[PDB]
Amino acid sequence: TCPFYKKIPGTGFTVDAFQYGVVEGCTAYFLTHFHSDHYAGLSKHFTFPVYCSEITGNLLKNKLHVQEQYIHPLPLDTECIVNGVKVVLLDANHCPGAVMILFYLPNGTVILHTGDFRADPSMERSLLADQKVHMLYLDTTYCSPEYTFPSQQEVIRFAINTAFEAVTLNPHALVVCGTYSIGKEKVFLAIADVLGSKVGMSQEKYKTLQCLNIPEINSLITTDMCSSLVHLLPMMQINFKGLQSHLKKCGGKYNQILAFRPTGWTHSNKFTRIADVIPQTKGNISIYGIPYSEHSSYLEMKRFVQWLKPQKIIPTVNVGTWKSRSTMEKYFREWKLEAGY
């Protein structure tokens, strides 16, 4: 049964709740972003309204094959009425097309649902700054003080330098980047751009990217592998056995792979900086793990929440155990007591 944290009080609106069958009472299913835990259940045989961003719209139409009539795309930063309730979509700073939703209830209650987000100070000068938010449905993926990681800009700077050095030392080296969903496109586009290449990828991954409204994208990507010295692979395939395999397939055009695995947090964040990173090396294949996050660090989350000063916080991540639930409530109480709300 659909959990209470996927339902919006006093509306017939649900958020990211496509895997339960029909939810009784629901006039409208919101989708925050095209990631599979959130969309799970959507297919060509959905005949209820889905509201989402334009980009998420393109992905539902072309990858899942949902029929045009059930997809309602909304623009961002625009007051819109949806079944007689004012709503706003705001950039979540997560993956392409990912949004937060502002709900203005008839009773006067204002509710913010973050979907998945990476909190940023630029959000403090958006439409959010204009009025009080009473209820916050919060992405708590990294709600614990151990979770630190660098800025996205720091990580891209590292990647660009690594790749450029290695290719300028050895012009027959190949850069591979791992992938499994949308998200983190800056990693491979930054590398490609320093190296004067397009990025080469399978037909399914090329199709996924052509839905994202990226500017000049036709100049940045291709399905012709041979012509490209930055390649995308399934993240499953980023290991020595699978890379070796792939190094064969190129047919004596490259002698060395330099690969990146953009991970979330890993326990080596607790003891090592970004300037001091090292790969695993089995011959001519090296594999970097780089902690490029599209979720809030603990301190980023804490700051956005202490600015917002919400009357109530409902977690949407790590809610399946009583220990996580209890631990999270503790942080919300400290935050509130520190900040005086």
Nearest-approach distance from CB 78 to Ni ion, in angstroms: 23
Nearest-approach distance from CB 43 to Ni ion, in angstroms: 20
Q: Listing from the earlier edge strand, what are the strands of the sheet with 86-91? A: 80-81, 86-91, 99-104, 110-113, 135-138, 312-315
Residue 53 phi, psi (nearest 5): -65, 165
Q: Give the residue with the Cβ less far from Ni ion, 11 or 32.
A: 32
Alpha carbons within 13 A on the beta-carbon side of 127: 17
Stretch that binds Ni ion, among 2-10, 59-67, 111-119, 162-170 (CB under 5 A): 111-119
Strand partners, 135: 111, 312
Nearest-approach distance from CB 340 to Ni ion, in angstroms: 32
Nearest-approach distance from CB 44 to Ni ion, in angstroms: 23
Could you tell me if 300 and 290 are in contact, meaning their C-beta atoms sit under 8 angstroms apart? Answer: no
Q: Give the residue with the Cβ less far from Ni ion, 150 or 183.
A: 183
Cα 153 to Cα 260: distance, rounded to the nearest angstrom: 16
Q: Give the residue with the Cβ less far from Ni ion, 94 or 246.
A: 94
Which token pair is 310? 């919400």
Stretch that binds Ni ion, among 114-122, 145-153, 185-193, 250-258 (CB under 5 A): 114-122
Q: Give the residue with the Cβ less far from Ni ion, 116 or 185.
A: 116
Cα 37 to Cα 220: distance, rounded to the nearest angstrom: 29
Stretch that binds Ni ion, among 113-121, 161-169, 186-194, 309-317 (CB under 5 A): 113-121
Site for Ni ion in 140-199 (CB under 5 A): none
Q: Give the residue with the Cβ less far from Ni ion, 35 or 246.
A: 35
CA 129 to each of CA 72, 137, 190, 330: distance values in angstroms, whole numbers, following the listed order: 27, 17, 33, 26
**Residue 139 interacting with Ni ion (CB under 5 A):** no
CA angle 109, 324, 123 (to 5 degrees): 45
Q: Give the residue with the Cβ less far from Ni ion, 115 or 310.
A: 115
Compute the chain's Rg from CA coordinates.
22
Q: Of 16, 116, 185, 300, which one interacts with Ni ion (CB under 5 A)?
A: 116
Question: What is the total residue count of the chain?
Answer: 341
Sole residue written with tokens 């709600």: 143
Cα 26 to Cα 51: distance, rounded to the nearest angstrom: 13
Stretch that binds Ni ion, among 28-36, 48-56, 169-177, 283-291 (CB under 5 A): 28-36
Task: Give me the 29-68 binding string for Ni ion, x by CB under 5 A, dash otherwise.
Answer: ------x---------------------------------
Q: Give the residue with the Cβ less far from Ni ion, 116 or 300.
A: 116
Question: What does the binding site for Ni ion look like in residue numbers (CB under 5 A)?
Answer: 35, 116
